[PDB]
Amino acid sequence: SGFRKMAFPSGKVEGCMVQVTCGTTTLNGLWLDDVVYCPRHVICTSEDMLNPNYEDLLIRKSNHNFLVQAGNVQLRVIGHSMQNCVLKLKVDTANPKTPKYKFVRIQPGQTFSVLACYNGSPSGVYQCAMRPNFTIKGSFLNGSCGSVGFNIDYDCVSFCYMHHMELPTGVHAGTDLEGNFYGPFVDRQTAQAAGTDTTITVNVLAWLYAAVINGDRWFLNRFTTTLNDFNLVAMKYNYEPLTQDHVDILGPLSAQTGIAVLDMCASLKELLQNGMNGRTILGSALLEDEFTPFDVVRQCSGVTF
Amino acid sequence: SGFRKMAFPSGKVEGCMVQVTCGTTTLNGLWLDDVVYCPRHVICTSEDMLNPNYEDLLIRKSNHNFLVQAGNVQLRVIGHSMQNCVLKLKVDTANPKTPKYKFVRIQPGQTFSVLACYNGSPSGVYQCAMRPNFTIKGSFLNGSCGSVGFNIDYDCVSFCYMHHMELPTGVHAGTDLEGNFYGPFVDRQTAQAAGTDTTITVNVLAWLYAAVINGDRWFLNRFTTTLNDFNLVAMKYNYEPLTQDHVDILGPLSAQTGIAVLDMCASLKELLQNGMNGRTILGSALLEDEFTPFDVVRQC
Ligand SMILES: O=C1[C@H](c2ccc(Cl)cc2)CCCN1c1cncc2ccccc12
Ligand SMILES: O=C1[C@H](c2ccc(Cl)cc2)CCCN1c1cncc2ccccc12
Ligand SMILES: [Cl-]
Numbered sequence A: 001s002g003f004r005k006m007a008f009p010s011g012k013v014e015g016c017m018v019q020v021t022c023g024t025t026t027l028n029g030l031w032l033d034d035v036v037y038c039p040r041h042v043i044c045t046s047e048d049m050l051n052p053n054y055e056d057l058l059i060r061k062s063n064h065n066f067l068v069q070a071g072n073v074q075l076r077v078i079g080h081s082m083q084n085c086v087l088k089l090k091v092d093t094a095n096p097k098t099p100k101y102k103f104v105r106i107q108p109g110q111t112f113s114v115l116a117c118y119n120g121s122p123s124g125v126y127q128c129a130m131r132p133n134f135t136i137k138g139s140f141l142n143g144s145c146g147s148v149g150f151n152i153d154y155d156c157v158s159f160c161y162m163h164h165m166e167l168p169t170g171v172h173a174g175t176d177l178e179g180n181f182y183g184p185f186v187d188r189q190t191a192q193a194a195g196t197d198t199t200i201t202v203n204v205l206a207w208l209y210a211a212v213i214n215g216d217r218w219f220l221n222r223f224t225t226t227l228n229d230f231n232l233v234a235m236k237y238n239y240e241p242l243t244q245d246h247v248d249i250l251g252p253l254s255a256q257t258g259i260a261v262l263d264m265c266a267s268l269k270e271l272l273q274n275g276m277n278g279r280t281i282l283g284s285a286l287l288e289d290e291f292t293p294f295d296v297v298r299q300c301s302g303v304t305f
Numbered sequence B: 001s002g003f004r005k006m007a008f009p010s011g012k013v014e015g016c017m018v019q020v021t022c023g024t025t026t027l028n029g030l031w032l033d034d035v036v037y038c039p040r041h042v043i044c045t046s047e048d049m050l051n052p053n054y055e056d057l058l059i060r061k062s063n064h065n066f067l068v069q070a071g072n073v074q075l076r077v078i079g080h081s082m083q084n085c086v087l088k089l090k091v092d093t094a095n096p097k098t099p100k101y102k103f104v105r106i107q108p109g110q111t112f113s114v115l116a117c118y119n120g121s122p123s124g125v126y127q128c129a130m131r132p133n134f135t136i137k138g139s140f141l142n143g144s145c146g147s148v149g150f151n152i153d154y155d156c157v158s159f160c161y162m163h164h165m166e167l168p169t170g171v172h173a174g175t176d177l178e179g180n181f182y183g184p185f186v187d188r189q190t191a192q193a194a195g196t197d198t199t200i201t202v203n204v205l206a207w208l209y210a211a212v213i214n215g216d217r218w219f220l221n222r223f224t225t226t227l228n229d230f231n232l233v234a235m236k237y238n239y240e241p242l243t244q245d246h247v248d249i250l251g252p253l254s255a256q257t258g259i260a261v262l263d264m265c266a267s268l269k270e271l272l273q274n275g276m277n278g279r280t281i282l283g284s285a286l287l288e289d290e291f292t293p294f295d296v297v298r299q300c
């Protein structure tokens, strides 16, 4: 019993974090085999950030302009290249702690663990979700750039996020490990803002199933609805549309609890229109949307890595 | 910016988790140097739990009755002893991944990271607090016994909890790493029930200071309170009494934000009275009590 915001064990990722220094800027790098990946903005001064020509700024840097430190050991940079918004620093030593890994680009609604790092040292791990507006509601301070997001799929670390910036509202923006930004964000000091966000409907439904698995049923009702009627309600309350794929993905949770997906949609519909009436669900007075259906199944079944 | 329930990186602890088997029962063990620590109830059957005599049950066991598996490698048990409610299995191999560590017994209100494990393999990490009723609201299933709670301030892992059981209300009870249970709990199947739980006042105050640091002041007011009037009101909402120690511990946060502890107490009193009025504080519609003053300073 119990239901917590649970992150993946971070050990396999901790053994990859390094400190990258370029001029006066120090941020984090991900050392996988003989390559250290980090945000390309590490080469920029504050003035450069206003209108950077990254190819031009990078051609001016040599290998010895990049100081990479792994623990109390300096790594020798022997090559440098850019892939989208990520800098790849070829180092003379392969990381002996390199885990089985892949670079995966996630979709909005998908959750992941963030290993927040400062000066190449892991400080904490937390679970978050890629918002529908492509930002993450992370917890990051100055020096956190280069911190990564990941999932573990069996024995393989799937790196899905690298931290690049904080937006004016305090939310965060970054790239996948191929350097492609999530969202319409750019690595330049210019006016940028998070778009209006919506609630991840399939995740709220998954969390309601987790509450039922954990013994909370007050929100259940005799009613059912259709996908079309429910999607009308979802649109009204800034909830993401629920697709037939979401319904299929919720099938296992529906079978385990005996509550049809559209039966749970009718509970959600009632919660949106009436509130909780002074009640809580899994210790929350708000509908939680940062647990996917797979996270609920994994936590309520005890999947190990 | 941002404020998340943040756990310590678990790598240093993952390299210590092992699987311990005794007869039909399999749970987790913590392998530190040449000793594997695990709940002594691993030596029991379900029928032994009503009134077990652990000394009598343990004297019947030999080293080869304990199977310890670290990864895909079997460790040889060469000694066994009991310390309070923890079994210490001396193994023939020291854990090469043993981190710099200490055993610390924590007080209610303290927080720690839990590395939930099954069959000696880590499944997830989450942040917990030792409740005033000495239970933890964990996320644990059958097979999670032996999973540990810890803090990692400055490269040293401070192990503070080892999971032993789930109580009838779904909350959890365990011991420190010396085998002393937190709370009036025993590793025996008996009516023990969690006592009525209360809110960790000093932690709610710390979290309100985190919200002020992060730019939220809507809940502040022009009032102050005496410490005693605060406690009289606070107890009426099942909040823990705030002591002078708690006031002293909140000093750094009070200095950083410029809000005196008793002025923050006045705001808490008003929040308890009025609710949030459709507003949130650091993404929460409830007053959060699982961040200590130290956690707020560490994160903000
Ligand atoms: O956002 C930035 C800066 C920046 C500015 C513009 C562009 Cl396009 C990219 C990056 C670089 C320094 C780190 N930083 C931060 C990143 N995360 C959390 C931060 C919390 C407080 C203060 C700064 C933070
Ligand atoms: O509480 C127990 C059992 C037990 C019984 C008596 C005594 Cl004295 C100690 C331990 C042993 C099996 C594991 N178990 C559990 C521990 N954590 C979460 C559990 C979630 C669901 C089901 C069982 C759980
Ligand atoms: Cl900069």
Ligand SMILES: [Cl-]
Binding pocket: B041, B044, B045, B046, B049
């Ligand atoms: Cl048992």
